[PDB]
Amino acid sequence: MTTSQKHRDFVAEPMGEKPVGSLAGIGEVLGKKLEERGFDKAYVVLGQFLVLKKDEDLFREWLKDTCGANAKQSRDCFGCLREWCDAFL
């Protein structure tokens, strides 16, 4: 899963108030759609993952249906948000 250094950097130190586009799998174009949806910060998006009880099918359908992310980009957010939770939750 050739994730960018952001995936390891994200699960290597707190998220603080970093921008949504900072989450692995979310690019600048996708971060803009979530931002227009009321998610101007990554911690708001991690909240959605927690509300879905880590349901991978509900999360991927939610992200894809919410912005149009591909099956591939959603996998990076699932493991990226989920691994952060494993070290942090």
Binding site: R37, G38, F39, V44, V51
Partner: protein
């Protein structure tokens, strides 16, 4: 199905803005709560 339920997330957000009503992310899970908030405000203007 509700009058306000036929509004799309983008249209719902612009409506709350017109009334200057603070809000967060709009999602079916909390969309209903937002539809009720606009109804209460719009009701006042109707009275």
């Amino acid at each position: 199905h509700d009058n306000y339920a036929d509004l799309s997330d983008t249209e719902l957000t612009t409506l709350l803005r017109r009334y200057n009503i603070p809000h967060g992310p709009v999602v079916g899970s909390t969309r209903r709560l937002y539809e009720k908030k606009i109804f209460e405000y719009e009701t006042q203007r109707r009275r």
